[PDB]
């Protein structure tokens, strides 16, 4: 799995904060919240990136991958969150969007694969 590194400060066994800015219009990235790993503890789901295109706010952000793990959103822990709160936070009135990004090691979590062939 040829993986090129961008910055040493960025590893796969640590958490790195990700700051963003308010965007406009819809149609863009998508956040998946469908859990199935440990659905034993209701009210405590998690959020992850499902789709993402190059040149998008999340793109220029610096670095993102389909599966990223957000631990905190502008100070909103994954402690019981509605399905309309996250989105609202993405465009919240806040001045800036500061969230924590976590990227565990390869094996802990599965790999997301959306439609599209390969060649």
């Amino acid at each position: 799995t040829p993986h090129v590194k961008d910055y040493s400060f960025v590893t796969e066994d640590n958490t790195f904060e990700v700051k963003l800015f308010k965007n406009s219009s819809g149609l863009g990235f998508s956040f998946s919240r469908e859990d199935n790993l440990i659905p034993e503890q209701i009210n405590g789901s998690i959020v992850r990136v499902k789709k993402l295109f190059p040149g998008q706010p999340a793109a220029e952000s610096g670095k993102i991958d389909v599966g990223d793990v957000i631990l905190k959103v502008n100070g909103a822990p994954l402690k019981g969150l509605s399905q309309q709160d996250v989105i609202s936070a993405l465009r919240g009135t806040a001045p800036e969007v500061s969230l924590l990004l976590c990227r565990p090691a390869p094996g802990v979590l599965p790999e997301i694969d959306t439609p599209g062939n390969s060649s």
Binding site: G26, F29, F31, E34, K51, Q83, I87, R91
Partner: peptide
């Protein structure tokens, strides 16, 4: 089992 509770379909 072949069922759920809530779903999602919102993006930006």
């Amino acid at each position: 089992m072949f069922r759920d509770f809530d779903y999602i379909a919102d993006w930006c």
